[PDB]
Design a protein around this ligand. Structure first.
Ligand code: SF4
Ligand SMILES: [Zn+2]
Ligand SMILES: [Zn+2]
Ligand SMILES: [Zn+2]
Ligand SMILES: [Zn+2]
Lengths: 417, 355, 752
């Protein structure tokens, strides 16, 4: 289905679809392929989960439901039609879909059609309403009555299937074919009208049963056992988890990249217990104001250093021209995209990746030179008034990029040379 | 006579926690909470309504899950009007899903549920997930039925084949299909289809769902994983970030490809490698090193001490409230027992006692 | 698990067992030791069939008597249940002993269920199916094809293969299901009906319907190849009196009379043609009747009697045919004037009820036909059909019915009655007269059973009171006790809804049937229970017309549209096949958990062998008292006869039958102890009937539950669902409800 990497890369229409959904994706994609000419497959190669998420979001569909039962008759009536529910009616009733498609594009209007439909007795029949000759219906819609009837016959023919003997009430009533007793009660048998005909409640009940069967066979779509069926689980062994416990052997390496004696510590301990019981003065704790002044110097130095650390506690406010700010952000973004794709190629590790690595190396070099030329532009646009800040802002991505270039050169010298 | 009822209730409670095991429990987690926002949760039957409390409890659940287990990504898909709507991709930042849930606050829950569609696109979202990550889904549900487009059993078989588990927290009562899901997905266990009895029970259930789950021996995936500790800088100049492409005063620096990021514990956007701190990995060590329960000594027998070893307070006097750590042979009060067993994760008696 | 009774080794296919099952086995073994019959009542929520089957198998193997086993039920569903459980038990025994013992046991049913002749299989009337099978395998067809292979009267190759191989060669030992037998006969091209008809003398245990034991026509054959001193058990036959009643009751319609006239004329003209072309066969039959031969005398096994023996064989006439009906033309004129007499009696203007003796006296007053020819009619007609070779028997099935009626009414006089009423439908366009033959007693058919077999076990799950069945049927049992539900915790919650949401009572009375307020209440709690019901719910009205009215007018209110939004709704169709598709739909709907509702009559076809469990049995809406139709002269004559016989209060018996039908409706919820369900009583009048109700049922019926409304019914049901949604510690039931082998040992020592 539409789930492989090849399928997701193939769906150019879906790619354009979420392209048109976003705006920074036009920005990024335009710079990536319209401006830089990157292979758009490798563009989308990162965004594969996003593509699949968009596809699966677009791909779901609802389950069937009794749309005619949700239809209410609502003096006068005003049509308040919902197109999704109109298509729901179409899907649930292909007869109604057909009656739409041979009359509205031929004879009259859609709201006129639906007014005729709500007027029609075919609507009442298809809904849970007993038909009545007092009702006149709509003649145009009610011409489809026998067509819907033969649809019902064909659908019932489809719905017929053999039954399991474990639950077969037909086999149950065919237990004794020579039962000769008495005629059962009118109460508990299906009653009829005065002239022997039925009222049709059996028809409406078999119709709603047909609706249920159509439901469940819509569920039963494309998208022996009695031994298991008759198991009595209540007298069986309880399930126990096979979860594995874990122990932990403990032997850690010592930290890598004079010794005191009991006599000497005991001597000092005796002496300091003697000093402890001897004396203790709070007043002697006051310092000499000179070594204390050096303490003041050290403390104040630490305060100054950490205060300058705290002095640099939406992005930050900047005094850039907004266009050059956007241009440099754009350049940073496409350089980051290039760098990530180059790392993807490099960490992949194949000889098939070699030309890709070389070409992305060329692109990184081009980005470097374009960064330098941008620095020349902000040079002769500022006189290095705040072109220094431009260079420093674009610095760390450039450092990482050129570090990657050095890594590529080093591995080239490692393998080839 | 209330103390006898409290004692027998504590006995019937402790009968479940008598067995404490050092099972291998998942750390690299993958948790999905789908939300239904349908007509059922519009009931004000619990105050103020089911939608509001599940919103609040989901806020708490997000906070607790990210606090305890910051080494997982969190995705939320809402269910509404016969459609399941993705609102939260799996991410390391909880704040994104917090904002998405805040959007879910003001909108109106309505419609009917479709676990088939919900679980199908949850499967699809869970598809590009590495092997060590434990794919598991929490599902909240208030209906007693489910309108669906097609079969659920094919989805059940696919989910079992793709090694993803589920846990259902139903609202009203048991639904047989949800029982079937929990049993078949959960190797025949019935310890996953849970029904609350009040909102406090719902709170306790959410707290229970916070915890990591044990893994199975047959589901063996024992391997290594590449890891990298980054380094934080505090620069004078604001600098462009790789992730959000904007000027940052500080930021960690990539250990491998020397780029910079804005938040942790996150993977690299550039060298594409996971970056953490040792605090984050040690955070689950109480799960890795569980604590034994502490036993009250009986009131009849002679007592080692008459006041609490840890908090240093007098033991109250019918029964004896002296919870003993047999690993350190010291008795403690109930308050200290609660704190050491839940908040703390060490026994100071065993810290003082040399091994 | 396996333990020993005092001399009886016994194996249970599960490690666990219930103490109620143990006491049940104890009393059954006590009954088997003492000899005779006993009545035991047990809560059907515990396992029954497996335990009794294990006891019977252990009894036959351990004791040197090795008596056969007779078990009977109502439906193919119950028979298949027994087959599956028996297969599981014998598989477990084979595994436990490490080897398979020699064993034979099968069921018994119709060719409509069984005849794999694919051409014959495509008919819906089992009578037509059997008739075609006789037409092309009756032996006469085989002989005609043997003398003339050019004759186009084919034979059933299934039957041919069964001719080829022998009766022990038909199957290996053991038990085979209906499905397994279908696979086997599909493989080997064998007729399973014929196979079963030859397995009768060989099966260690035989299972068939209650009809095959009660009706003489389908029971004499069973009595032929059954051992007299086997073991007989009955299950859930607490409504078997109705089967007994219909075993000897018959009705007469105008069109049947017309068909009888046409068939008699066709037979008369055929006899005239045969007398014209070759009178040798007629003279041969006439002289064979002069010697006085009978159906068993002349007919072989491969040919079957046309008019099957309507009466019990203990009451048959075995002497010669009178000369007045001995000739074929004499017998035709005899039957025709019988038809004419019936047409004369046919045109009364009101309700007629007379004794058969009085009818006989009137008949011999008007015409000159005696009880001896009027009894011999069926045998004479069967012989005439056999000689006549009139196998296109379509016009003569009414002749079979009329000969059956004549023979039956000429056989008995006490506990039988004839009802003639001028309207078949009272409230129709025109009245249509009817003659109805009845059998006022029910214990007539059990007399061959009781006097042929001693080791007969009568037991059920919903039989109450125990003494009422020996009251209504002249039999006695050795011990009469029930079993209480030794429950650890409550699992079933019955409610008695004596009032609606507006504190308005509800009842199912047909006069007040079209009451819109009662409709509003009924739809009200129907909606409420639909909204709170998770998986599966069933509704049981007392009558189909009551349904049809009340469902059509809730369809007028559109309440069913609201009900659509939560579950499916399934209604008992008059077609059992569509009903089967409907119950399959309900089954699959509760399987996928989207939820569905069944609508079936309290006496309807669902209620007699279909169980519901753990999502299917969750909550039941029983609708009112399922009283029978009040103005039946048949019912009133029954009431008069049973009151005259056993001094039975009529209204009390009516409440009993209502009573027992309600219990049969509500007994299909709790399959295992793990299951749970809630019961409702949707009538005000039920509150006086808890003393009537079965003991284990009513023990959960608390005194606060005796008169409830919709609101606390809803609250209690929600709280019950909340309760049953919780797990349970095994320690609370490890020794009081679920028993291990050691638990049973400890209990046995405690008894010691
Ligand atoms: S011969 Fe066998 S298969 Fe054919 S109709 Fe008779 S019983 Fe059925
Ligand atoms: Zn950033
Ligand atoms: Zn990196
Ligand atoms: Zn303390
Ligand atoms: Zn300790």
């Amino acid at each position: 289905d539409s789930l492989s990497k090849e399928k997701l890369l193939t769906n150019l229409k879906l790619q354009q679809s979420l392209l048109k959904g976003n705006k920074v994706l036009m920005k990024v994609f335009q710079e990536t392929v319209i401006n830089a000419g990157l292979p758009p497959s490798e563009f989308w190669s990162t965004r594969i989960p996003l593509l699949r998420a968009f596809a699966l979001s677009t791909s779901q569909k609802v389950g069937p439901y009794n749309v005619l039962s949700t239809i209410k008759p609502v003096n006068k009536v005003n049509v308040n039609l919902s197109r999704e529910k109109i298509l729901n009616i179409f899907e649930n009733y292909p007869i109604v879909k057909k009656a739409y498609t041979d009359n509205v594009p031929k004879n009259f209007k859609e709201p006129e059609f639906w007014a005729r439909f709500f007027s029609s007795k075919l609507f009442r029949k298809l809904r849970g309403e007993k038909i009545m000759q007092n009702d006149r219906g709509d003649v145009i819609i009610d011409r489809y009555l026998t067509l819907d009837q033969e649809f019902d016959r064909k659908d019932d023919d489809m719905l017929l299937h053999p039954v399991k003997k474990i639950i077969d009430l037909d086999g149950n009533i065919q237990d004794d074919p020579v039962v000769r007793g008495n005629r059962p009660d009118f109460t508990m048998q299906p009653g009829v009208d005065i002239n022997g005909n039925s009222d049709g409640t059996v028809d409406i009940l078999k119709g709603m049963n047909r609706l249920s069967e159509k439901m469940i066979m819509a569920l039963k779509n494309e998208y022996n056992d009695e031994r298991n069926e008759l198991k009595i689980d209540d007298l069986n062994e309880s399930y126990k988890t096979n979860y594995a416990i874990i122990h932990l052997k403990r032997n850690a390496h010592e930290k890598t990249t004079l010794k005191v004696s009991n006599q000497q510590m005991l001597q000092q301990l005796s002496l300091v217990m003697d000093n402890l019981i001897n004396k203790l003065d709070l007043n002697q704790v006051v310092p000499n104001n000179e070594v204390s002044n050096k303490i003041n110097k050290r403390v104040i130095t630490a305060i100054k250093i950490n205060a300058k650390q705290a002095k640099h506690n939406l992005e930050v406010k900047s005094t850039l021209p907004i266009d050059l700010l956007e241009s440099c952000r754009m350049l940073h973004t496409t350089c980051c995209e290039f760098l990530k794709h180059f790392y993807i190629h490099f960490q992949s590790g194949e000889q098939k990746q070699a030309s890709t690595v070389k070409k992305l190396y060329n692109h990184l070099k081009d980005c470097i030179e374009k960064l330098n030329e941008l620095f020349q532009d902000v040079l002769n646009g500022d006189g290095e008034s705040m072109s220094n800040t431009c260079t420093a802002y674009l610095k760390p991505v450039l450092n990482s990029i050129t570090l990657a270039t050095h890594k590529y050169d080093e591995y080239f010298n490692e393998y080839n040379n | 006579a209330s103390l006898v009822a409290s004692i027998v209730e504590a006995r019937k409670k402790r009968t479940a926690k008598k067995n404490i095991t050092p099972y291998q429990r998942g750390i690299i987690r993958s948790l999905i909470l789908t939300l239904d926002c349908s007509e059922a949760m519009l009931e004000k039957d619990l105050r103020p309504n089911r939608h509001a409390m599940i919103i609040q409890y989901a806020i708490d659940f997000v906070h607790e899950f990210f606090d305890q287990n910051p080494i997982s990504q969190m995705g939320i898909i809402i269910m509404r009007n016969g459609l399941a709507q993705l609102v939260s991709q799996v991410s390391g930042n909880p704040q994104d899903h917090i904002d998405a849930l805040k959007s879910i606050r003001k909108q109106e829950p309505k419609g009917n549920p479709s676990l088939q569609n919900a679980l199908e696109m949850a499967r699809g979202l869970l598809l590009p997930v590495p092997a060590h990550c434990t794919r598991e889904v929490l599902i909240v549900f208030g209906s007693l039925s489910t309108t669906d487009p097609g079969d659920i059993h094919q989805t059940i078989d696919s989910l079992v084949s793709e090694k993803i588990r589920v846990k259902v927290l139903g609202l009203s009562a048991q639904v047989a299909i949800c029982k079937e899901l929990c049993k078949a997905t959960n190797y025949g266990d019935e310890s996953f289809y849970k029904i609350l009895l009040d909102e406090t029970h719902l709170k306790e259930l959410f707290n229970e769902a916070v915890t990591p789950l044990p893994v199975n021996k047959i589901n063996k995936g024992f391997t290594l994983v590449k890891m990298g500790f980054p380094t934080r800088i505090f620069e004078d100049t604001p600098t462009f970030c790789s992730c959000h492409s904007k000027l940052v005063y500080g930021g960690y620096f990539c250990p491998n490809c020397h780029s910079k990021v804005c938040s942790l514990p996150t993977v690299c956007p550039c060298c594409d490698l996971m970056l953490i701190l040792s605090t984050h990995l040690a955070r689950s060590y109480h799960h890795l090193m569980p604590l034994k329960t502490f036993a009250e000594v009986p009131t009849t027998e002679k007592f080692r001490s008459e006041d609490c070893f840890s908090c240093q307070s007098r033991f109250p006097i019918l029964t004896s409230s002296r919870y003993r750590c047999e690993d350190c042979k010291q008795e403690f009060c109930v308050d200290c027992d609660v704190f050491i067993h839940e908040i703390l994760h060490n026994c100071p008696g065993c810290e003082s006692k040399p091994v | 698990m396996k333990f020993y009774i005092d001399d009886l080794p016994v194996l249970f296919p599960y490690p666990k067992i219930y103490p109620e099952q143990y006491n049940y086995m104890c009393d059954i073994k006590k009954t088997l030791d003492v000899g005779g019959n006993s009545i035991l009542e047990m809560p059907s929520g515990t396992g029954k069939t497996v335990s009794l089957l294990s006891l019977t198998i252990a009894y036959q193997m351990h004791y040197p008597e090795h008596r056969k086993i007779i078990y009977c039920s109502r439906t193919m569903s119950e028979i298949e249940k027994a087959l599956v459980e028996l297969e599981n038990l014998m598989d477990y025994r084979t595994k436990e002993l490490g080897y398979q013992e020699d064993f034979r046991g099968l069921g018994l049913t119709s060719r409509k269920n069984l005849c794999l002749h694919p051409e014959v299989s495509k008919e819906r009337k089992g009578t037509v199916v059997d008739e075609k099978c006789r037409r092309m395998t009756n032996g006469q067809a085989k002989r005609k094809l043997e003398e003339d292979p050019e004759a186009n009267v084919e034979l059933c190759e299934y039957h041919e293969n069964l001719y080829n191989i022998e009766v022990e060669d038909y199957l290996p030992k053991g038990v085979f299901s209906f499905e397994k037998l279908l696979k086997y006969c599909e493989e080997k091209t064998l007729c399973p009906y014929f196979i079963v008809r030859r397995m009768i003398s060989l099966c260690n245990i035989i299972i068939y319907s209650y009809h095959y034991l009660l009706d003489p026509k389908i029971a004499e054959r069973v009595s032929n190849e059954v051992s007299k001193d086997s073991i007989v058990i009955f299950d859930e036959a607490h409504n078997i009196d109705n089967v007994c009643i219909e075993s000897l009751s018959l009705d007469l319609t105008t069109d049947a009379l017309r068909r009888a006239t046409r068939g008699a004329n066709a037979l008369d003209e055929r006899i005239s043609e045969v007398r014209k072309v070759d009178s040798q066969k007629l003279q041969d039959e006439y002289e064979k009747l002069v010697q006085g031969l009978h159906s068993a005398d002349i007919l072989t096994d491969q040919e079957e009697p046309f008019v099957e023996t309507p009466v019990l064989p203990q009451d048959l006439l075995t002497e010669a045919i009178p000369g007045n009906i001995r000739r074929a033309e004499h017998f035709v004129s005899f039957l025709k004037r019988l038809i004419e007499y019936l047409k004369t009696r046919m045109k009364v203007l009101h309700v007629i009820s007379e004794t058969p003796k009085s009818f006989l006296q009137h008949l011999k007053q008007l015409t000159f036909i005696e009880r001896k020819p009027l009894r011999f009619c069926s045998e004479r007609l069967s012989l005439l059909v056999r000689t006549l070779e009139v196998t296109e028997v379509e016009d003569f099935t009414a002749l079979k019915d009329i000969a059956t009626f004549a023979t039956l009414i000429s056989t008995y006089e006490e506990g039988f009655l004839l009802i003639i009423e001028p309207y078949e439908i009272e409230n129709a366009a025109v009245p249509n007269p009817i003659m109805r033959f009845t059998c006022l007693d029910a214990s007539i058919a059990i007399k061959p059973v009781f006097e042929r077999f001693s080791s007969v076990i009568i037991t059920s799950g919903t039989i109450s009171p125990l003494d009422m069945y020996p009251r209504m049927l002249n039999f006695k049992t050795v011990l009469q006790k029930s079993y209480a539900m030794t429950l650890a915790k409550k699992s079933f919650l019955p409610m008695i809804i004596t009032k609606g949401s507006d504190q308005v009572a509800i009842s199912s009375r047909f006069e007040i049937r079209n009451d819109p307020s009662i409709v509003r209440n009924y739809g009200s709690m129907l909606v409420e229970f639909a909204k709170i019901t998770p998986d599966g719910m069933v509704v049981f009205f007392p009558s189909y017309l009551y349904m049809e009215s009340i469902v059509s007018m809730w369809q007028t209110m559109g309440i069913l549209d609201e009900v659509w939004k939560h579950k499916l709704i399934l209604v008992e169709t008059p077609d059992a096949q569509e009903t089967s598709l409907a119950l399959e739909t309900y089954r699959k709907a509760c399987s996928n958990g989207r939820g569905a509702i069944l609508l079936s009559v309290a006496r309807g076809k669902v209620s007699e062998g279909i169980d519901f469990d753990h999502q299917y049995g969750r909550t039941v809406l029983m609708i009112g008292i399922p009283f029978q139709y009040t103005e039946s002269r048949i019912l009133k004559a029954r009431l008069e006869f049973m009151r005259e016989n056993y001094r039975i209060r009529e209204n009390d018996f009516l409440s009993f039958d209502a009573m027992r039908h309600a219990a049969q409706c509500l007994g299909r919820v709790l399959r295992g102890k793990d299951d749970y369900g809630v019961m409702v009583l949707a009538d005000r009048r039920f509150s006086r009937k808890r003393s009537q109700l079965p003991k284990w049922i009513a023990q959960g019926l608390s005194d606060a539950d005796l008169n409830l409304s919709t609101d606390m019914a809803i609250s209690n049901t929600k709280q019950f669902l909340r309760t049953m949604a919780q797990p349970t510690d095994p320690k609370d039931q490890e020794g009081v409800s679920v028993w291990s082998y050691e638990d049973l040992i400890k209990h046995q020592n405690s008894r010691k």
